């Protein structure tokens, strides 16, 4: 009985694969980017990427190829998952609706077979007769492609070559032929086979098995005009066809392994190659020919083009542009040019796409001492290495702050016709209007002719033809720029009050109840036009001359009072078109029409807090999409502000929201304010682009960040960070980091590019003498990072061949000082289980790093949490507990040795600890008895752990290596010295990700219990919470209902997907829910949703609310 919830906080950002072709249309260039469990679909444009579709799958995409057989309009997509789910996908659009379809599927795992070295490789023959796969050593799996075979059924063929490296289907082959580099004892060899389904055997290929180099590793098959295979080694590259053999050994490739190729030119005259380094090569097939007779290949060469982010994926797109698929660092768009500018790099970066990288460690914050956590992560590796601060929501920067418990609206007035700046703020008040002539940045409250000061203003626009406007309770006044007095002033013919305002800069519409008017500020006076009553009382009115209108404004939209409805109308007529009869006894407190990139929209906030958004047609004007969304428990006021181009809508509530503009959609990100009542743009000669905000009591004005739900700040490190600690008292982070450096002309090491550790403000090296007994080495550092500036305050360099591996920041013993302790490891390529290392105690002084204490140790200090005023530390197989003398030294009390390799420890305040490497997780207490360790319980499963966290006194979370999560707890059991000694895995789950780090923290706040964040190798941030048995059940059941109803892309059983699974065991998930699934709910049509309820109670949309309440834990 363990009960948990897991949700994505940020999807994986690492790019796992990518591919190009025409999957959208026969005449349209798509790039498909595979993240982990996400397919991204783009059209390549002149600008770059137009996003088209972002589907998920129930699987880690292992194979992604586009293909097209005979009689096929556009490229089908083949996908093999890691759990061996194969499928074939087709891009389908119903004019406005986009759907990816499953043309076939089948699971292709074989109960037999070991999964080979070098992983899954699927492939596809040029003629599209079939799909060849290599999953298992010895076996090659063949899947004929035929109109039928919708189940992708497949035979195996035996393969003498037990240890294949890479394989491709050769071009221009009468028979389906494959080409493969295999490795036996003798070396590595290229070989071929024709492939016949006719009789489920191979035959022989068109050419003798040749040889290839010891590190040979990529096969490339060159298209029809050339044929044959390009095979890429280390320090070398070669070509093969029948009798032809071409070779090259440019030293320029020697320094790093090529790692991806991609063809540029269909003929294959040109190819791109990427590197462990980021270097981008161009591999050219020197042209050549001999009259009537196909093109030969005289030669081939490498041209270093420059540098990219480290590339998993590479894909030439349109003209000179290349997408660089990165997993170790940020992905990017990148222009190649015939000319190499400064530095001599034909490769200029165009776009850079954020990868939260492999997140190697991370921590909450803890910055502007507010109450929300910023998450700070060590990311990337090598030169992509970085920190990334991640802050949920959109912040705003406050300049002035006038405490005003009234403000009931506010409007943006310039007092000088010329200047784009507004030096006045007129604001609705407690049945009043205060004016604010600002002396630039200074506040001062005075009169202003024709602008009533004893009247609750309800509007105040910037009306053209040199005039000002002030709609009050009473009369819709008018004031001049030339005269500046009472130019006009309207007044209802009966002495009746205006109930609801409206205006832009030329158009004027008021209402008095059910009544409607319409005025115009025609030079120096208000002339009326229409009048029309309505069913019920006018709740709200929107009008802004949208697209094809300059001041004068097309159609109209309205919310009424008894029937609680919102309805599309026109103008001088006032003719009712289509309408919606929204439910509820609560009135639409605000209606809005707008424009964005290329679309018009109708938005309606009610007073319950919830909202309805719909799309308007400047021409036609009718329905769109029914779907309400809760936000500010208090009526939402909607406005529109200055930002950039896509200028957007601000939602004022208890829960202030912005509404962005996604993939031509509209974002719904939180704003980091206490509350907002009303809000408007600005530009004073002393408060430029700022939106003034007003709450219960206070005016405020400032800029607005980007948008995207979440914001990400990035400290580029150039080297590869490893661990990281915040030491608040000293307002900085320590970060363990490593760079790499070469052996010199004798042994010394240089420093290719500058990194954070060499560009440091100050610096250090270890003096300590505790020891005494081309080539790449690592150099490791503690870094002091200013929390405010993210400057490398100080760098401490560690000893030759010493590894910092663990980092704490704590106070120790009675000692009222706070240290950065660092566990380390003396690492030589001779052994493989360090026998020496150290614990070092640092202090960071005024601007200073004082090596306070060191401690030799007889193994690698893997992890070390601060225990209980003492220092607990894992020292290779043996966990120890060090105390801090008064006389300032780390000295032992106890150790425990029942550890194959203690990699991870964590501490629930109490004298309780937990961890391990290949035999997943022990629990241990510390005994104020013989100040000792009593091993309370382990878990007797063979889990190769990666991360480990304590959720509560009983619950222990672990991540491991198949990408599985599992929870453990202590067995409440009779016979309490056995069933006791054994804790049971009472929650299992296949996550789909490698978890490096857990931590208690949350991204949110100023249903669920606890909040543990996680960072993955893929840049996914998850979150794990605990559950009441009842929510569990509600949700567990809901999980099942939800899956009968959702069309899982490639027809993959969700439950099959989430199934705890190693290559030696497969159990269904228990004690876990993907909120990711749960949340799938909301993206569902109401019909499909109603279905989900067939049966304390069971409703229909009480849940629509339950699910919302959760989306809000991250």
């Amino acid at each position: 009985m363990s009960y948990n919830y897991v949700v994505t906080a940020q999807k994986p950002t690492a790019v796992n694969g990518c591919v190009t072709g025409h999957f959208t249309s026969a005449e349209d260039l798509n790039l498909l980017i595979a993240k982990n469990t996400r397919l991204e679909i783009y059209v390549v444009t002149a600008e770059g990427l137009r996003p088209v579709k972002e589907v998920g799958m129930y699987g880690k995409i292992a194979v992604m190829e586009l293909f097209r057989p005979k009689g096929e309009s556009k490229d089908l997509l083949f996908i093999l998952t890691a759990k061996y789910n194969a499928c074939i996908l087709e891009y389908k659009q119903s004019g406005e609706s986009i759907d990816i379809i499953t043309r076939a599927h089948g699971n292709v795992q074989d109960r037999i077979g070991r999964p080979s070295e070098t992983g899954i490789i699927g492939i596809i023959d040029p003629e599209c007769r079939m799909i060849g796969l290599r999953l298992y050593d010895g076996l090659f799996k063949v899947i004929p492609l035929d109109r039928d075979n919708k189940e992708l059924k497949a035979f195996n063929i035996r393969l003498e070559e037990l240890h294949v490296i890479d394989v491709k289907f050769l071009y221009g082959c009468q028979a389906p032929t494959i080409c493969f580099v295999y490795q036996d004892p003798q070396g590595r060899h290229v070989k071929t086979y024709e492939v016949s389904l006719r009789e489920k055997e191979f035959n022989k290929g068109p050419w003798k098995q040749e040889n290839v180099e010891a590190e040979a590793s990529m096969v490339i098959a060159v298209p029809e005009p050339f044929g044959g295979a390009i095979i890429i080694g280390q320090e070398s590259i070669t070509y093969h066809n029948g009798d032809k053999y071409l070779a090259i050994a440019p030293p320029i490739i020697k320094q790093s392994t090529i790692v991806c190729h991609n063809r540029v030119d269909p003929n294959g005259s040109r190819y791109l190659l990427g590197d462990m380094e980021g270097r981008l090569f161009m591999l050219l097939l020197e042209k050549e020919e001999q009259m009537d007779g196909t093109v030969t290949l005289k030669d081939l060469r490498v041209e270093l083009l420059g540098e990219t982010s480290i590339a998993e994926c590479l894909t030439y797109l349109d003209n000179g542009v290349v997408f660089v698929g990165s997993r170790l660092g940020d992905s990017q768009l990148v222009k190649l040019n015939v000319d190499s500018n400064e530095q001599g790099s034909y490769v200029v970066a165009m776009e850079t796409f954020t990868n939260l990288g492999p997140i190697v460690d991370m921590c909450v914050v803890d910055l502007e001492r507010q109450g929300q956590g910023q998450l700070v992560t060590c990311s990337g590796a090598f030169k992509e290495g970085s920190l990334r601060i991640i802050r949920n929501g959109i912040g705003i920067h406050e300049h002035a702050s006038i405490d005003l418990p009234g403000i009931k609206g506010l409007w943006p007035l310039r007092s000088d016709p010329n200047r784009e700046t507004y030096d006045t703020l007129v604001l609705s008040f407690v049945g009043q209007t205060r004016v604010l002539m600002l002396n630039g940045e200074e506040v001062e409250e005075t009169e202003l002719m024709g602008f009533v000061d004893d009247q609750q203003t309800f509007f105040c626009g910037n009306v053209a033809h040199q005039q000002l406007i002030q709609i009050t309770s009473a009369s819709v006044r008018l004031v001049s720029q030339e005269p500046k007095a009472l130019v006009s002033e309207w007044k209802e013919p009966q002495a009746k009050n205006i109930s609801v305002a409206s205006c832009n800069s030329s158009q004027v519409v008021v209402a008095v109840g059910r009544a409607l008017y319409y005025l115009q500020i025609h030079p120096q006076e208000l002339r009326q036009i229409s009048h029309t009553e309505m069913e019920h009382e006018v709740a709200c009115l929107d009008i802004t001359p949208l697209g094809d209108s300059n001041g004068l404004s097309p159609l109209c939209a309205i919310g009424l009072w008894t029937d609680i409805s919102a309805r599309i109308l026109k103008l001088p007529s006032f003719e009712l078109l289509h309408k919606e009869m929204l439910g509820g006894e609560i009135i639409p407190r605000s209606i809005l029409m707008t424009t964005f990139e290329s679309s018009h929209y109708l938005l309606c906030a009610l007073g319950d807090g919830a909202l309805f958004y719909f799309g308007l047609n400047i021409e036609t004007g009718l329905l769109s999409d029914r779907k309400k969304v809760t936000l500010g428990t208090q009526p939402t006021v909607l406005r529109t502000f200055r930002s950039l181009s896509t200028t957007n809508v601000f939602a004022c509530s208890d829960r202030p929201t912005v509404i962005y503009s996604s993939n031509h959609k509209l974002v719904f990100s939180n704003v980091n304010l206490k509350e907002v009542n009303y809000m408007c743009p600005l530009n004073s000669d002393g408060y430029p682009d700022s939106l003034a905000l007003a709450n219960n009591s206070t005016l405020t004005i400032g800029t607005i960040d980007e948008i995207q739900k979440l914001h990400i700040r990035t400290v580029p490190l150039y080297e590869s960070p490893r661990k990281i600690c915040y030491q608040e008292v000293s307002q900085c982070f320590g970060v363990l980091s490593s760079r790499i450096e070469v052996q010199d002309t004798s042994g010394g090491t240089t420093a290719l590019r500058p990194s954070a550790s060499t560009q440091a403000l100050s610096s250090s090296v270890s003096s300590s003498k505790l020891f005494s007994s081309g080539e790449e080495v690592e150099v490791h550092n503690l870094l002091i990072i200013d929390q405010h500036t993210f400057e490398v305050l100080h760098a401490h360099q560690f000893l030759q061949n010493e590894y910092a591996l663990s980092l704490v920041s704590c106070k120790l013993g009675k000692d009222p000082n706070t240290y950065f302790i660092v566990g380390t490891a003396m690492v030589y390529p001779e052994e493989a289980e360090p026998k020496q290392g150290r614990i070092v105690v640092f202090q960071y002084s005024d601007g200073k790093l004082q090596t306070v204490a060191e401690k030799e140790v007889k193994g690698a200090v893997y992890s070390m949490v601060e225990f209980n005023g003492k220092l607990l530390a894992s020292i290779n197989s043996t966990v120890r507990l060090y105390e801090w003398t008064t006389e300032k030294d780390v000295r032992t009390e106890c150790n425990h040795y029942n550890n194959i390799m203690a990699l991870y420890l964590k501490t629930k305040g109490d004298f309780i600890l937990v961890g391990d490497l290949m035999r997943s997780v022990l629990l241990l207490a510390y005994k104020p008895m013989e100040g000792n360790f009593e091993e309370i319980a382990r878990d007797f499963n063979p889990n190769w752990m990666s991360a480990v966290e304590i959720l509560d006194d009983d619950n222990f979370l672990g991540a491991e290596n198949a990408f599985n999560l599992f929870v453990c707890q202590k067995d409440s059991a009779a016979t309490t010295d056995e069933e006791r000694q054994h804790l049971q895995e009472v929650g299992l789950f296949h996550l789909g990700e490698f978890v490096n780090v857990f931590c208690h923290g949350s991204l949110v706040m100023q249903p669920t219990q606890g909040s543990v964040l996680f960072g993955t190798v893929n840049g996914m941030i998850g979150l794990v919470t605990s559950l009441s048995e009842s929510w569990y059940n509600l949700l567990l059941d809901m999980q099942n209902r939800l899956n009968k109803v959702i069309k899982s892309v490639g027809k993959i059983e969700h439950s099959f997907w989430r199934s705890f699974h190693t290559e030696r065991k497969t159990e269904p998930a228990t004690g876990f829910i993907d909120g990711d699934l749960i949340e799938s709910f909301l993206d569902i049509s109401r019909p499909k949703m109603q279905e989900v309820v067939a049966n304390r109670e069971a409703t229909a949309d009480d849940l629509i609310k339950v699910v919302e309440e959760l989306t809000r834990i991250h």
Binding site: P358, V360, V827, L903, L917, S946
Partner: peptide, 13 residues
């Protein structure tokens, strides 16, 4: 050594 092999893992393939 495991160290290296523990890195390579924390950082995928």
């Amino acid at each position: 050594h495991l160290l290296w092999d523990v890195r390579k893992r924390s950082l995928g393939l």
